[PDB]
Design a protein around this ligand. Structure first.
Ligand SMILES: Nc1nc2c(ncn2[C@@H]2O[C@H](COP(=O)(O)OP(=O)(O)OP(=O)(O)O)[C@@H](O)[C@H]2O)c(=O)[nH]1
Ligand SMILES: [Mg+2]
Length: 301
């Protein structure tokens, strides 16, 4: 199962850059932008400049019409970069011209090509003003129409987890962890073996609206509950787990992994989930983990 991560627009490229720098592997990174200079600064293995004839290598100047038109004209390049992917993550900051306009097009192409398509986008800080926000909301609507599952990160949530002195790059790295947990969560679920596979992923995620993808790690007596609570919690997400209609859940531990622990973790997630939840639950024994427990949760709907 091949995973690709596609960053669209300035924010998208920045996320790709920060994540490649902090060493993601066995994932293909693709950078797409109208802005030629941005692309030159990209560490991404595969780069696509869109809308050359529109912008002459400039950005979209906050015009979403441009980003959309640029993406549509480069359909052939975009398809070619995508082909072979089983699952695609399109990441982008909403509110500008390139991301807002081109990211839904990129996402729609991937979904039409048959890839399981996940969007991870940001809404701008309130201080960026009412017009940026409104424009971003249009982006979010378009993304939601184009993806299998969408994950929205309001940039304002970053303000809630920093103090007066927290460096901006650290804050942005926190936001990157949202996409990171999603990507390694899948990669592990598909890795041999959890008695779970990509077919399970597709059942839980295909056409499911919104998604949460989390990983919790813990130890000690309350380890199972603690790991699970970590996995289903993030203050950066617009979407809580309550009412989920689909859950893919895996618990990994050493030989000490008890049946009661698995039940405890599963009950944590099950309480939050809707009565008619489609839950696919897996367990993996990995002696390497010693006293550690790892809980992975993908929730949708
Ligand atoms: N979390 C996070 N958000 C970002 C980052 N960079 C930009 N954003 C957000 O994304 C929104 C869009 O900014 P850009 O991605 O730079 O704009 P663009 O998509 O390239 O569009 P144009 O520059 O007009 O062509 C901004 O309003 C910010 O709120 C980033 O590095 N991290
Ligand atoms: Mg730009």
């Amino acid at each position: 199962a091949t995973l690709k991560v596609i960053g669209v627009g300035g924010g998208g490229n920045n996320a790709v850059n920060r994540m490649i720098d902090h060493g993601m592997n066995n994932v293909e990174f693709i950078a797409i932008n109208t802005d030629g200079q941005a692309l030159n600064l990209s560490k991404a293995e595969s780069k696509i400049q869109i809308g050359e004839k529109l912008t002459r290598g400039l950005g979209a100047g906050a015009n979403p019409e441009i980003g959309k038109k640029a993406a549509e004209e480069s359909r052939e390049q975009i398809e070619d970069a995508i082909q072979g992917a089983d699952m695609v993550f399109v990441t982008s900051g909403m509110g500008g011209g390139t991301g807002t306009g081109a990211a839904p097009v990129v996402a729609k192409i991937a979904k039409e090509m048959g890839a399981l398509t996940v969007g991870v986008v940001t809404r701008p800080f309130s201080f960026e003003g009412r017009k940026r926000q409104t424009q971003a909301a249009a982006g979010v609507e378009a993304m939601k129409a184009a993806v299998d599952t969408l994950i929205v990160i309001p940039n304002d949530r970053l303000l809630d987890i920093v103090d007066k002195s927290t460096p901006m790059m650290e804050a942005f790295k926190e936001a990157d962890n949202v996409l990171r947990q999603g990507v390694q969560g899948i990669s592990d679920l598909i890795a041999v073996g959890a008695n779970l596979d990509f077919a399970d992923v597709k059942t839980i995620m295909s056409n499911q609206g919104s998604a949460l993808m989390g990983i919790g790690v813990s130890s000690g007596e309350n380890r199972a509950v603690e790991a699970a609570k970590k996995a289903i919690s993030s203050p950066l997400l617009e979407t809580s787990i309550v009412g989920a209609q689909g859950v893919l859940m895996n618990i990994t531990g050493g030989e000490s992994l008890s049946l009661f622990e698995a039940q405890e973790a599963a009950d944590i997630v099950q309480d939050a989930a809707d009565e008619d939840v489609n839950m696919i639950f897996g367990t993996v024994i990995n002696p390497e983990l010693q006293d550690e427990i790892v809980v992975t949760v993908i929730a949708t709907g």
